[PDB]
Design a protein around this nucleic acid. Structure first.
Ligand code: MG
Length: 156
RNA sequence: AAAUUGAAGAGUUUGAUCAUGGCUCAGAUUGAACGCUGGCGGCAGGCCUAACACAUGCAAGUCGAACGGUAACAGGAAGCAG
């Protein structure tokens, strides 16, 4: 029912004639726990405002994910520029074995049993982007059946 | 019947950013040592260095059913003296 959680809040600076201008960026992630997950990156002069902006962004532009019984559909890799991510379905009771950002994104998405690792850069925004991309691309057996022109029973 | 149920990151370069890239940390372990402290038990372990030098005691004897035998001991026998 739209569970949301803020991964990282980071202070960034701009320089002007006067001096430095600080502002805050908030990376949040929302999801319905049934497949839908979406991340948002808001910027404002103060943290709460930034978070609100991020939340609105995340709530819009969500994406559907094919989940098989609260777990992944197959082992999937994902990249986004520096962040290359691996995530593998695991037996019921394994829990989310996943990094920071990754854990958040998976949890809001609704995966209950995963084995993840973040290779490459572990920059939260890029890592979240990578995970969402991987989750999105991951197809289900009904999808493969549709593509190949067979029944799901012939493929298994 | 069961005996692979298995994979987490963080700090640190920049006014800020992403990347590269090192350093550091979170875990487990030990024939450990040192500091402070210290009640009991169970089960293990205990010269990693000088294969350096070694006082002293012990760590390989046994068989008389292989053999001459009796140093003893322990006993009887024969000779005896009270
Ligand atoms: Mg030695």
């Amino acid at each position: 029912e739209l569970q949301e959680k803020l991964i990282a809040v980071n202070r960034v600076s701009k320089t002007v004639k006067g001096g430095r201008i600080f502002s805050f960026t908030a990376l949040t992630v929302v999801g319905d726990g049934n497949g839908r997950v979406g991340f948002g990156y808001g910027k404002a002069r103060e943290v709460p405002a930034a978070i609100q902006k991020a939340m609105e962004k995340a709530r819009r532009n969500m994406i559907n994910v094919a989940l098989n019984n609260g777990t992944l559909q197959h082992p999937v890799k994902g990249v986004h520029t520096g962040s290359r991510v691996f995530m593998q379905p695991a037996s019921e009771g394994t829990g989310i074995i996943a990094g920071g950002a990754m854990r958040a994104v998976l949890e809001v998405a609704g995966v209950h049993n995963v084995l993840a690792k973040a290779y490459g850069s572990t920059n939260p925004i890029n890592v979240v982007r990578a995970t969402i991309d991987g989750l999105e691309n991951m197809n289900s057996p009904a999808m493969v059946a549709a593509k190949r022109g067979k029944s799901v029973e012939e493929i298994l």
